[PDB]
Amino acid sequence: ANPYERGPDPTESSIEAVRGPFAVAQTTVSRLQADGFGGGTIYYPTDTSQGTFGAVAISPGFTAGQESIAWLGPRIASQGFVVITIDTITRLDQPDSRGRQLQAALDHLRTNSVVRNRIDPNRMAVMGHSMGGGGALSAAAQQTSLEAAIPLQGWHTRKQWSSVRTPTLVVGAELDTIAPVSSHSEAFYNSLPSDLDKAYMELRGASHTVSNTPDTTTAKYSIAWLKRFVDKDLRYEQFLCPAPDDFAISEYRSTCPFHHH
Ligand SMILES: [Cl-]
């Protein structure tokens, strides 16, 4: 039995839900309290009876505040994760710096008095929008123990990601003119190792801002990816393999079936 499974057996509806099965609470990390990042909000399940949970850090993009990705916090955490949505040190920080800040936010959770006993510090993930998604890739390249990475309309000058060993879901926006998929998202996906567990999901008709307000497709597949890889939860592979049929997805590529033990 997989000791990391949390919550009831899933359905398409359960992964689409705005609130998942876990009631959540939150705590604020002030900029002063944060070492190596700009502060954030931690969302976490209050129920401890199923065990500890994986941890996820989420970064905004260039010029943007935490508020641009805040909706992801409770939507993911309520599926059984401890999630920190960060501010960066400055809004004009570059991608590799954002990756260091994502790692610093995860490291902060290890000693945070509200959540340190609620996390499994060995099961961590990174996500981010725009340069924050470039940051997520950067963090994975620097810390191969990360269990998942999810760049949302990622932006990075570095196009080569052959060193990544963290299962990665690359989410592109079809009509993105800021981080166009041909030069950013698709290039990142094509340079990830061919033997990595990975997927590329392009959002039909979407602009760069699709991640900045609730988007069910983004949420549902982020949830499924984090479950599958942070929790090793094979109940969630059904949503990822074979290719999803959602209207909102204009293209899907993957290395299905994914590896497991
Ligand atoms: Cl755009």
Numbering used by the authors: 2 to 262
Please give sentences taken from the publication describing this entry.
Plastic pollution has become a global environmental challenge, driving interest in enzymatic polyethylene terephthalate (PET) recycling by using polyester hydrolases. Metagenome-derived polyester hydrolases, such as LCC and PHL7, have garnered significant attention due to their high activity at elevated temperatures of up to 70 °C. Their engineering led to the development of optimized variants, including LCCICCG, LCC-A2, Turbo-PETase, and PHL7mut3. , PHL7mut3 has been designed to improve the activity and thermostability of PHL7 by the Q175E, L210T, and D233 K mutations. In this study, the PHL7 wild-type enzyme and the improved PHL7 triple mutant PHL7mut3 were expressed in E. coli and P. pastoris, and their PET-degrading activity under various conditions as well as their thermal stability was assessed.
In the P_PHL7mut3 structure, electron density supported a single conformation for K233, whereas two conformations were modeled for the same residue in E_PHL7mut3 and P_PHL7mut3_ng. This difference might be primarily responsible for the observed catalytic differences between E_PHL7mut3 and P_PHL7mut3_ng. The mutations introduced to obtain non-glycosylated enzymes in P. pastoris resulted in a decrease in melting temperature compared to the E. coli-produced enzymes.
